[PDB]
């Protein structure tokens, strides 16, 4: 009940601006530690009289000044009380300054601090990244503040609604460049006390959130180009990468996308530059720091002669995402983390507008269906999901905050925005967003502000809806989950229900809306689009959905809506007949829909599993990427459930039969793999065809991949494998080979120069079928001299994905949990195979044994795994025999 | 004879004005009547100015700019 023991800051004090000086030491001290020293002044206003200053501070040591950890000064004639004492409160990560009196309402004060912290290799706060230039160790000082690590570099009121201006100074080796949010204010100058250091001050920032600050000291090089909106774009990377041209594509796309977003939203980018910088060590994909956007090398750099088309798509989409955040996140910021989707869902959606602009021939917007909608529907069909906008009172600790950086906030956000754009039209949507951005520039918002401005746009355009924007979208935003819409085509009746993968699951979160939605329903009849419909009730009837004779209907054209669709068995049969007769008559996206929906309905016991399997029969003559990907993704569950059981043989025989003609088609069309298709989707289709043929035992594929890998081994410096095929060729060649292939791939990894190639080799190495090799590799994943810490868990996940690595890794996690924790995706990946009572009991015993240690940002994930495991136990029991029989009868 | 190298070495810009420049017209003090390799995307040529054709001098006379481009996108005058 003490303010310093509560996780949210008091409302008594509010900052205006800060100055911060930071000085990193890029060589170890006597203790072997890399450190930084700094100072700060915060100017703040007292809103309510208080005798305590509560400010965030994490892993900082303070140098005493005038007898205390800080110095308190007046502003404008104020006379602050004397300081009684300070304390560091570790649980809430606060510096608490207890005063001998009360502050005065509506007066300003300044607080000065001098401090030191570790420049740790922990990828959080102010940290160090390392690379090699030849034989020379290079150490870089860099930052990652989101969500709650700005406090780890200097004391600050570290909440996104505590906006302030920042005056940054970096003290750095005279030979190294200092970068921050703004451009340098004048030239760097030698430090007077020691001319081996230069002092670089930066211009004052805009009013902004603490989580967007960035401080980087390095000797990176860069390329640069002024964008057509006058913004300076720079691409920064290790000197060898810049000289090799690996930043050129980012320079090609960054400025044009930025100008596109500024025009599209009628809202200028206000800063003089937008730096893009690629770090050798970085936890997430990137971070949208205002003026200094950081990236993994694998999300920013690109080599046209060795990087894949998938790598290029990742680069352009990640750049588009980070640039989208300049509007949705930086200029306008969430009031609190509970509304995180307002940043990430928009960025997750708007990235497609930007990337499609940069690469208009790729048709990326379509991929939103697979990569976002169906990605998130998996977890959002669980009882342990969470609403798009969680109640603010539930999100308090850093762990709860970092838990929300999940599939809901990113992908459901994007899906719901896709749906909103579809039923409003994108033009009306962006008009309303422009109004939102103009009104709330440099301020903070909640979801209701968005609804109000979208309603203003709807009214301006005279769009007619069944009710207000607020009442429609609250259904999609304030309660979890999504509906399945069930159509009875005999009568044209529709109904909706909350879609749950397990009917037996225990939904404990109440909804004031009773898990009923207002649903925009599009539809086609025999390939012709029908009038749009609004489903407002639990059930309704409309002749739009009644059929007679040979007619079929489909709902959710191009899957613009965030819902699943079921039909009566007769309509399903008509659809299957259409797929056999002429599958091109159904839009490709709706074919993906038919497959994914049918498989999920089967999991939920709403359709027979044989119906979903029958929906895959036509794939033997499907050449499009998207329906195959939807099938393979759905069948991934079958693989996880059955790849340690008698069903796997028959399953592989079936996939082999279904994929062989496509494989032969690509073999011919590619001139025996000499070329790749022009169209991106066809390139992805080719890669999936190869991966499927090899994974399921097509002898021509095994021969092709082993031959190509051997040819590379015979000419290591002349890689003959097209980048698009390298991931699958490496994995299957390692699986087909032995110690010699593995050691070759490992040596290629250690000496690698491009991070894309390293990533592919590192994933491929987990495909060894030899347990001893997997164990040795597991031992390598934990040594930062061998595998960068940023990649440790990813590599462990690759190992757990190998059927032979499942038990190895699960046992490792049980044996090493304490060490792992004290030194989320891993739990999800390691547990998804679980389908036995034994494994469930192991998971529960693991929970019991580690309840005190806790699971941090993986807590929810453990609950979800338990739910899935229980469902998996039941699903296998119900389906294992029937599925075996189906595969047996269909694999011939 | 002309030679130049792209800026690099740390903190420098690879696609900006070249670091090293050497425009040496032999027999100059106004004289009267390519060394740089393909270092990346960098190329260079001579361009016309006020004179119609494609007494010479590097100093001002009471001209022809030497252009150096990067990927045919960023151009720089010497
Ligand atoms: C950060 O820098 C700005 C710019 O100098 C400071 O704002 C100035 O503050 C003084 C003192 O009140 C005023 O007289 C100036 O007019 C202000 N200038 C501008 C452009 O606003 C700001 O105080 C600095 N913040 C800190 C914490 O030092
Ligand atoms: C639904 O998706 C399909 C496929 O993405 C769209 O069809 C494309 O439309 C564009 C625009 O005219 C054409 O250039 C393409 O050639 C079409 N693709 C095919 C395979 O024919 C369709 O327009 C989308 N419709 C809606 C309402 O979203
Ligand atoms: C901060 O103080 C603690 C305890 O005295 C010490 O262990 C740690 O090394 C210090 N950190 C720095 C960067 O000096
Ligand atoms: C540091 O300052 C000195 C002072 O002249 C200057 O020569 C040097 O170029 C500066 N370093 C950087 C990286 O700007
Ligand atoms: C991007 O690079 C390509 C070269 O492949 C060039 O044609 C194009 O003009 C560049 N984009 C811009 C905006 O200059
Ligand atoms: C599960 O449901 C029962 C009643 O159906 C309820 O008492 C219980 O609280 C639910 N589970 C949780 C964790 O609340
Ligand atoms: C579709 O599944 C049904 C059982 O649900 C089965 O009788 C039928 O044979 C399957 N379709 C084909 C073409 O075999
Ligand atoms: C290169 O420049 C230097 C001075 O910068 C000069 O002494 C030398 O003669 C030049 N060399 C050539 C080949 O022009
Ligand atoms: Zn983001």
Author numbering:
A (entry chain A): 68 to 890, 899 to 967
B (entry chain D): 305 to 333, 338 to 341, 352 to 372, 386 to 393, 397 to 412
Sentences from the paper on this structure:
Crystals of the HCoV-229E RBD–hAPN complex were obtained by co-crystallization of the complex after size exclusion chromatography. The asymmetric unit contains one hAPN dimer (and associated RBDs) and one hAPN monomer (and associated RBD) that is related to its dimeric mate by a crystallographic two-fold rotation axis. The structure shows that receptor binding is mediated solely by three extended loops, a feature shared by HCoV-NL63 and the closely related porcine respiratory coronavirus, PRCoV. As our complex shows, HCoV-229E binds at a site on hAPN (H-site) that differs from the site on pAPN (P-site) used by PRCoV. Glu291 in hAPN, a residue in the hAPN–RBD interface, is an N-glycosylated asparagine (Asn286) in pAPN and attempts to dock the HCoV-229E RBD at the H-site on pAPN leads to a steric clash with the N-glycan. The HCoV-229E RBD binds to hAPN in its closed conformation and structural comparison shows that the H-site does not differ between the open and closed conformations. With reference to the HCoV-229E RBD–hAPN complex reported here, we now show that 73% of the amino acids in the receptor-binding loops and supporting residues vary among the sequences analyzed (52 sequences in total), while only 11% of the RBD surface residues outside of the receptor-binding loops show variation. Finally, we show that the six invariant interface residues on the RBD (Gly313, Gly315, Cys317, Cys320, Asn319, and Arg359) constitute only 45% of the viral surface area buried, the very region expected to be the most highly conserved from a receptor-binding standpoint. Indeed, our analysis of the six RBD classes shows that the receptor-binding loops possess a remarkable ability to both accommodate and accumulate mutational change while maintaining receptor binding.
